[PDB]
Design a protein around this ligand. Structure first.
Ligand SMILES: CC(=O)N[C@H]1[C@H]([C@H](O)[C@H](O)CO)O[C@@](OC[C@H]2O[C@@H](O)[C@H](O)[C@@H](O)[C@H]2O)(C(=O)O)C[C@@H]1O
Ligand SMILES: CC(=O)N[C@H]1[C@H]([C@H](O)[C@H](O)CO)O[C@@](O[C@@H]2[C@@H](O)[C@H](O)O[C@H](CO)[C@@H]2O)(C(=O)O)C[C@@H]1O
Ligand SMILES: CC(=O)N[C@H]1[C@H]([C@H](O)[C@H](O)CO)O[C@@](O[C@@H]2[C@@H](O)[C@H](O)O[C@H](CO)[C@@H]2O)(C(=O)O)C[C@@H]1O
Ligand code: ZN
Ligand code: ZN
Ligand code: ZN
Lengths: 183, 184, 183
């Protein structure tokens, strides 16, 4: 079981603002002590489908959280739907929900849960993706590990942009990053 | 399969952008299961794109290098990259002849569909920035697109471009790493 | 044996300007002919701990060097301490110091040592990381392979920034890159 993923089709699997308003494509491949991750996002409807900052100046960011319990299982408060996340089988997923994926969780010593101790920035990775694949439409994808509550582990994607986009569909290029694995 | 498909890493020209063997593309593809970890750099040694001067030629701002593969993952002759040294790695060179299969290194067609009249999504593109001559003030964009060429089953296209006005700058780049979802 | 690392704790292991003034977290995971690297830096004391370019406009960069001999063993003149640079075991290291790691070394034909032959830029990788995890606090991390002398192989991290930061602690987000291995 070396890859946990959302199948790479275009069917909605994530709820940002309203039910199933987006397709998060996330592939986590275990390369031993590091997880190699590849991510992209297609928003298909709702509030974040077409960005028009002339009309809505305040719509400049949104968040997608993946919350996991002690066994690396996705919790239902996550934005990504549970039915859509599992180990890879061909171009699809296994038939039944996995029970353990601790080896794909962000390492708690590298990336500790919030506490009264000093918080370090190494639990964040920043990247830039491009809306519609156009070079002049960058948006930031900030990924943070284990900073959510109500979970043993978490991966949070905070998307934001600073440009004033007018009628730009929120569907992105892909970004790769890695993180240190719990086991 | 943790093998590596590569161009070998010396600097002998192995690619044709504007004229025969005018450049050396160094591309290393390593299979990490469902993802291919890729490392790429480029050295142009002659011809039109060797030395850039956007004051005399402001129109020269981009070029393309295409790798075309057949259904077996074999590089096709009409790719910009020459077939002679694109092969699986054996030490600092290649295995004795020519792989026949490398489908496991090809860009996934569900993730990155060939052109059609269905909506074209941006996820088949990865943008990166590399630097000419290793200088921090000489960025150029390397845009990599998967499976968008025709006359092939799979493809990897590198579109190089720059918006800075370069003056007699040699086009040889730093390296960029990206990954993509593997077909198998 | 597929991972050479600094361990993921925050105990200082690197000397930039003064003894153990920082924790360099570096994980090298061998993915065959390519090494997948993940790096971040936390400076805890000394000259590069708090950056203030109003006060010291001259402090705009520093370097961290890892020098290796023919066997891939870290030389003591590296900025990183030999103490906790070893193959991984859980969240720590193996008890005994390794004696060979040539397969983690940057390839000499791809990245040759300086000579009177033409020097090419492919032995460099540039990335951007963010101080304190703030998006408006970018710094460049430039990594160069095999350009140091007095070693068979080397990996050098050159950090620099161009913005005038005022009392910004140098602790970074993480960055991932890869390089061609010697064997
Ligand atoms: C693919 C990529 O790197 N996109 C860049 C983009 C392109 O370089 C540009 O659109 C190509 O012509 O530039 C972006 O920044 C614009 C910004 O760039 C600074 O260097 C410049 O000083 C500013 O005046 C301004 O041009 C863009 O938003 O278009 C960023 C994007 O990441
Ligand atoms: C390696 C890297 O990130 N290079 C940057 C480059 C360097 O940060 C900078 O040259 C180091 O001083 O900065 C580039 O953009 C520049 C801006 O940072 C600067 O404020 O204004 C410059 C124009 O006067 C320029 O836009 C650069 O030098 O081209 C971009 C490059 O990616
Ligand atoms: C995480 C990231 O990409 N950070 C960018 C940063 C952010 O996009 C921005 O601060 C929003 O948080 O933007 C940087 O570039 C700036 C431009 O976005 C801005 O328009 O002009 C600034 C100069 O006045 C600056 O060039 C930044 O804040 O430095 C670049 C950084 O990588
Ligand atoms: Zn629409
Ligand atoms: Zn030249
Ligand atoms: Zn501090």
């Amino acid at each position: 079981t070396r890859t946990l993923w959302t199948t790479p089709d275009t069917s909605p699997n994530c709820t940002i603002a309203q039910d199933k308003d987006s397709k998060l494509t996330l592939v986590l491949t275990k390369c031993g002590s590091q997880i190699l991750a590849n991510v992209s996002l297609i928003v298909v409807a709702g509030k974040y489908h077409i960005i028009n900052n002339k009309t809505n100046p305040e719509i400049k960011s949104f968040t997608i959280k993946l919350l996991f319990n002690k066994n690396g299982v996705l919790l239902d408060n996550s934005n990504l739907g549970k039915a859509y996340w599992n180990f890879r089988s061909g171009n699809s997923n296994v038939s039944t929900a996995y029970e353990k994926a601790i080896g794909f969780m962000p390492n708690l010593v590298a990336y500790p849960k919030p506490s009264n101790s000093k918080k370090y920035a190494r639990d964040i990775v920043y990247g830039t993706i491009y809306l519609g694949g156009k070079p002049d439409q960058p948006a930031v994808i900030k990924t943070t590990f284990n900073q959510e509550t109500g979970c043993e582990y978490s991966i949070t994607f905070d998307f934001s942009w600073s440009k004033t986009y007018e009628n730009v569909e929120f569907e992105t290029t892909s970004f790769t990053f890695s993180y240190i694995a719990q086991e």
